Amino acid sequence: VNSFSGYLKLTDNVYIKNADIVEEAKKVKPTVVVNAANVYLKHGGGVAGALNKATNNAMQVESDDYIATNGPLKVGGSCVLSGHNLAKHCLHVVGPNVNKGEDIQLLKSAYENFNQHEVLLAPLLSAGIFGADPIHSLRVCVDTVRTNVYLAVFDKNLYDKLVSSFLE
């Protein structure tokens, strides 16, 4: 349980590894895995699509049920649902999509949800199709999160850029 191996320390509580977050979740068995969700919890692509596919659509079925009760999430908000076979819990967090004009300030609010959980396996929020600068997103993470965060970054080129920008 929570057997993280091969992570590089960035700060006392933020670690990083060049790895696939789905493969890590299966090896590590974490208490919490974080999903880079959208407000409708439609796990179509990116991290969200990969995590959902690894549950063979169990996560989407549960998410559809939650959205029928609560309506859409808010940007900056989150919900804790089942982790299915990847984790005990999955924390679905909505970061801002700056392509759509959503406020980059809200990325702080997004990361703040991490502080309700003592250890998390997570991706960088608001990267990819959400349009934010990933190095900037890591800055906000290390400024905001006070609990133990293990970040999985798939792209080796981006991984090297991140480790350079933080330790060089």
Side-chain angles (χ1 to χ4, degrees):
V1 162
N2 280 327
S3 307
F4 292 101
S5 63
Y7 280 76
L8 183 76
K9 186 180 289 293
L10 295 190
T11 62
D12 273 19
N13 63 306
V14 182
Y15 306 83
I16 195 180
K17 182 181 187 182
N18 168 234
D20 177 7
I21 187 174
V22 172
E23 287 301 307
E24 279 296 293
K26 295 199 271 143
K27 316 190 226 193
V28 171
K29 303 190 163 113
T31 295
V32 181
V33 61
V34 169
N35 183 29
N38 52 64
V39 293
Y40 298 110
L41 297 184
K42 293 300 172 176
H43 316 300
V47 170
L51 294 169
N52 180 46
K53 244 50 201 52
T55 71
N56 309 276
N57 246 326
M59 176 192 276
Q60 188 67 75
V61 179
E62 177 193 27
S63 297
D64 292 342
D65 186 78
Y66 183 87
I67 288 303
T69 62
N70 173 86
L73 277 60
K74 295 214 280 203
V75 180
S78 73
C79 74
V80 183
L81 298 174
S82 173
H84 305 277
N85 46 307
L86 307 168
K88 178 183 175 182
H89 298 332
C90 174
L91 175 68
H92 302 265
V93 181
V94 183
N97 187 327
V98 307
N99 290 331
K100 283 163 184 165
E102 296 173 354
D103 195 342
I104 190 75
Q105 285 303 294
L106 287 176
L107 179 61
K108 182 268 290 179
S109 188
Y111 269 120
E112 271 282 352
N113 311 278
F114 285 29
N115 288 325
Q116 281 74 81
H117 305 274
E118 183 164 357
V119 186
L120 304 99
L121 174 64
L124 295 175
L125 295 182
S126 289
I129 66 183
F130 290 82
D133 164 28
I135 306 180
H136 173 77
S137 176
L138 175 69
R139 298 273 173 221
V140 180
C141 178
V142 297
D143 210 46
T144 303
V145 184
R146 299 186 233 95
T147 53
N148 300 131
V149 175
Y150 290 79
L151 294 170
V153 177
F154 177 66
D155 191 327
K156 166 69 174 166
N157 289 326
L158 180 67
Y159 176 90
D160 290 343
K161 188 171 292 163
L162 285 172
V163 176
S164 172
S165 291
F166 209 88
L167 305 180
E168 302 176 22

